[PDB]
From a paper:
Human gamma-D crystallin (HGD) is a soluble, monomeric protein expressed in the eye lens during fetal development. The high expression levels contribute to the refractive index within the lens which focuses visible light upon the retina. However, this halts further expression of HGD. This means HGD must remain correctly folded and soluble for the entire human lifespan in order to maintain visual acuity. In order to observe structural changes in HGD, we take advantage of an arginine-to-serine point mutation, R36S, first identified in congenital cataracts (HGDm).
UV-lability of the Cys-DTT disulfide was tested by exposing similarly aged crystals to a UV LED at 285 nm during X-ray data collection. In the first 5 ms dataset, DTT adduct cleavage is visible at C41 and C108 in both chains, with oxidation to sulfenic acid observed at C41 in both chains. We show that UV exposure is then able to disrupt the disulfide bond, and partially restore the conformation to that of fresh crystallin. However, with continuous illumination we observe the formation of sulfenic acid at C41, cysteine at C108 and no obvious changes to the structure of the neighboring tryptophans W42 and W130 in both copies of HGDm in the asymmetric unit. No evidence of these modifications was observed in the electron density of the light structure nor was it possible to locate the liberated DTT. The analysis of atomic coordinate-derived conformational space (RoPE, described in Methods Section 4.6), show that while aging of the crystal produces a large shift in the conformational space, this is partially reversed by UV exposure. The corresponding interatomic distance plots also show a reversal of the conformational changes that occurred during aging for each chain. However, total reversal is precluded perhaps due to the rate of structural relaxation and oxidation of C41 to sulfenic acid, although a much smaller covalent modification, may continue to influence the conformation. In support of this, we have shown that after UV illumination of aged crystals, HGDm returns at least in part to the original conformational state of fresh protein. Hence, disulfide cleavage likely proceeds in the most part via tryptophan excitation.
Author numbering: 1 to 172
The structure:
Amino acid sequence: GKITLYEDRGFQGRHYECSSDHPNLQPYLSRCNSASVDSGCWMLYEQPNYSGLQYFLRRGDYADHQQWMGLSDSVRSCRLIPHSGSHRIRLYEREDYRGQMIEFTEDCSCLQDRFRFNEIHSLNVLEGSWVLYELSNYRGRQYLLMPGDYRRYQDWGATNARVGSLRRVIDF
């Protein structure tokens, strides 16, 4: 993968090129207002060392931070999300994989249309990387999910169990 981050809007200002995970952009970039993704799927992070608000970017050009749904121009670390050959996630009504369960292998823009629960209290990412969104149609707070067990919503870094949509991390 390759991403170019720019300090100012419309691909102007001081810039920095990443080919891999960077836990600390602070010495190189004082803010980020535009970005060009040549290749790979990237997660940008408000704070250093992959913490604070998260933003998913794919191949393409972002002329201002609003285009990746950024709330500010703070980008202090970034992750190249590894390629996955296949995608499967189980969502559960309750903590520790109890209650009603639904399994997805494809993107879902409205979770409540398939699974009549506003809150997801645990999930199992069996295959691939996903992005959980707080709201329907891929809006609100974003949480990157990599393969693993998530026995409660804190495990995916959320302050609540609100989930409205989710998407596979895929290029194409």
